[PDB]
Each structure stands twice: as C-alpha cells, then as structure tokens.
C-alpha cells in the first residue's frame, strides 16, 4: 500500500487520493503508515505540560508541585515527601532507624553494608544519606 | 508576533547558484508546512517548494524540480533554498511563507517581504 | 500534474457593481481551494479556504462557490480599496499552484 510510506509528523490522507498530510492541531503520528493521527494528550487537573505536544510526538505531561508522576508515562501524581522519609496510606512518615531515602519520592532502604565489601563504616547513615564506607 | 524575514537575494550570473535564508521567530515548527512563492516582476504568483514539520518532507513544482532544494535548520529556525543552474525565468521576488490550518488543512496563510533575485550576466 | 486556468486575466467595475472571477482546475480537487487578494507592495491576503468559507477578518461581500474543477469568487458590492490581484490556489495534491491571477480595475 502507498500509506505505508507516509513518515512519522503525516498521515496517509483519505479525502485527497492517499497523499501524506500534516498531522493537524492537537494530534501526533511517531510511527509512519497510519491513516489518521492520534489526539494529543491534555496536561490539565493534577497533570500540568512539560513537553507541548508537535506533529511527531506526544505531549508530556508532569505533576503540580509537591507531587510527582506514577508509572508510565505520568499516569498518576503522588504527593511527594521530604528527604528521610516515605509515603504511607497515613501520609508522610519518617525512615526508621538503619534505612535512608535521598529523595522527595520512593521509600525508605537499608544502608549499604560495608563489611561485606571488607570495608569500615566512616560515617554512619542517617534518614536521608546512606553510610560513607572506607577505602 | 510571527516574523518571516528572507536573505540571500541579489544578482546571479546564468548558469550559477544561489542559497535563500528564511529566519523565522514568534512560532515553533512543530505543525503544518512551510513554503518559497515566487513571483517574476509584473507576473502572477508561483508555488515553488513546500517542506513539512517533523518529517522534513519536501514538494517541489516541475518548473524548478531537480535544481531547488528546501530544508530547514530548526536549531537556527532558518529555512533554506538552494537554486542551481539558474535561468532568466527565475528573475523574481522570493517570499517564504507559513501555513495555517483553515476548514480541516494547511494553507499558505504568513508571507515574508521578500527577496529580489536577479538573473542576469 | 495539476493546472489552475482564471478568467478573466483583467476586468474594470466601478464602486458598488458586482464581478464574478473563475477559475478552473484540470482535474477534480473536491472543496481544498483557497482565494487570495494581492495588493501592490502588500503580502497577499487569504479571503475563503475551502473553496466557500469567507475567512474571519473579511468582508461578507467577498463569497465563494464551486467543487470538483470549477469555482468562483464574487465581490457584491466593490470599494476603491478592492483594486488588486485575485488567485485562487489548489490544495489537493501536495503541490499547490496558484492560478494565472485576475487584475481587478476599479472604474471611475
């Protein structure tokens, strides 16, 4: 089929003979052969835009502040916690003692053993940091 | 504000080349098509070249098909038409232009002020 | 390829008449054909898109009609500001030629 040879940014246009047209406002095509182009997704609510949406690629979208983006391709916004902390279904708690999070999402982990790598502990880990281990 | 504003126009010896720039501001080329109409002094209006965003995919019209060459340099946001073995007939004002998408297509709808090529030894 | 034929070249009316412009496509092109108006010194301007749509910003005398291979445009009521060169422009291919033009006078 001559379709199949529209790039990515076109599609193959129905209405004037199979000729490759512009993908139009609001809509994308990142693979090439298709007969119309996909709607583009729209950044509003939770969501807020990062990447605007172009004729060859999707618009990407990010989270209000204070929350960050769940699974692929920012499907969720979860509320975002402090460094030394994780997120509970109780809100934000505290790391327990011998576990560390250097970051405003994820959860709590041990710290690195270092006796196992025969190294000495230099500086201890805390709630936000992990142990410093020696040469 | 969309800006179009052509360069590279002048006097050009019969048999010789000449590159056109088109810097453009106030837009991003993430949709539609951009395009070089030229128009020889008193005549009428000629499509002669389209490139579409994304893709780069490039329409020419037979009178200047194997000698013109459009591509855009969207890191510069400049437009570029490369004319090679240049005749009287291509004495004319150049002007690029931007579509805009009207009644379920792109159309030429922002032109530049042009630039005046002159073929002549 | 595609060829786009204007009739008349030139015409002269005179202030309030009404002038019908052609203009013939050498192969079906449905509705995708646009009228433009070019002043002298001025970048030419998009009266109707899809071949009867009367572009916002334009004066409901400027009208369109036709599919297929023939189309016209008509001015109901012509001001002095309406001197100019109209084209019509085919969009069905990919490859858009403008018609001959049309040099419109206005009469005095």
């Known amino acids: 089929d001559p379709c199949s040879n529209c790039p990515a940014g076109t599609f193959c246009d129905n209405n004037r003979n199979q000729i490759c047209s512009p993908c139009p406002p609001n809509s994308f095509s990142s693979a090439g052969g298709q007969r119309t182009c996909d709607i583009c997704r729209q950044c509003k609510g939770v969501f807020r835009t990062r990447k605007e949406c172009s004729s060859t690629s999707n618009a990407e979208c990010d989270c209000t502040p204070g929350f960050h983006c769940l699974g692929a391709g920012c499907s969720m916004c979860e509320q975002d916690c402090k460094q030394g902390q994780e997120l509970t279904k109780k809100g934000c708690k505290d790391c327990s003692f011998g576990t560390f999070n250097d970051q405003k999402r994820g959860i709590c982990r041990p710290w690195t053993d270092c006796s196992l790598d025969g190294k000495s502990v230099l500086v201890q880990g805390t709630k936000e940091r992990d142990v410093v281990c020696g040469p | 504000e969309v800006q179009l504003l052509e360069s590279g126009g002048g006097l050009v010896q019969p048999g010789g080349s000449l590159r056109l720039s088109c810097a453009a501001s106030?837009?991003?080329?993430?949709?539609?098509?951009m395009y070089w109409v030229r128009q020889a002094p008193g005549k009428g209006l000629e499509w002669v070249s389209s490139?579409?965003?994304?893709?780069?995919?490039?329409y020419y019209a037979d009178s200047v098909k194997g000698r013109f060459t459009i591509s855009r340099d969207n890191s510069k946001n400049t437009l570029y038409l490369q004319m090679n073995s240049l005749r009287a007939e291509d004495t004319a004002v150049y002007y690029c232009?931007?579509?805009?998408?009207?009644?379920?297509?792109?159309?030429?709808?922002?032109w530049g002020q042009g630039t005046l090529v002159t073929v002549s030894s | 390829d595609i060829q786009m034929t204007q009739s008349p070249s030139s015409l002269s009316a005179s202030v309030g008449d009404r002038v019908t412009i052609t203009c013939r496509a050498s192969?079906?092109?449905?509705?995708?054909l646009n009228w433009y108006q070019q002043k002298p010194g001025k970048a030419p301007k998009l009266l109707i898109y899809?071949?009867?749509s009367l572009q916002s910003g334009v004066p409901s005398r400027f009208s369109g009609s036709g599919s297929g291979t023939d189309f016209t445009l008509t001015i109901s009521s012509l001001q002095p500001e309406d001197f100019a060169t109209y084209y019509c422009?085919?969009?069905?291919?990919?490859?858009?030629?403008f018609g001959q033009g049309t040099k419109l006078e206005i009469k005095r």
């Open positions: 192969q079906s092109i449905s509705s995708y």
């Open positions: 490139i579409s965003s994304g893709s780069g995919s490039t």
């Open positions: 232009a931007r579509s805009s998408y009207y009644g379920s297509y792109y159309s030429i709808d922002y």
């Open positions: 899809a071949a009867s």
């Open positions: 106030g837009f991003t080329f993430s949709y539609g098509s």
């Open positions: 422009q085919q969009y069905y291919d990919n490859l858009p030629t």
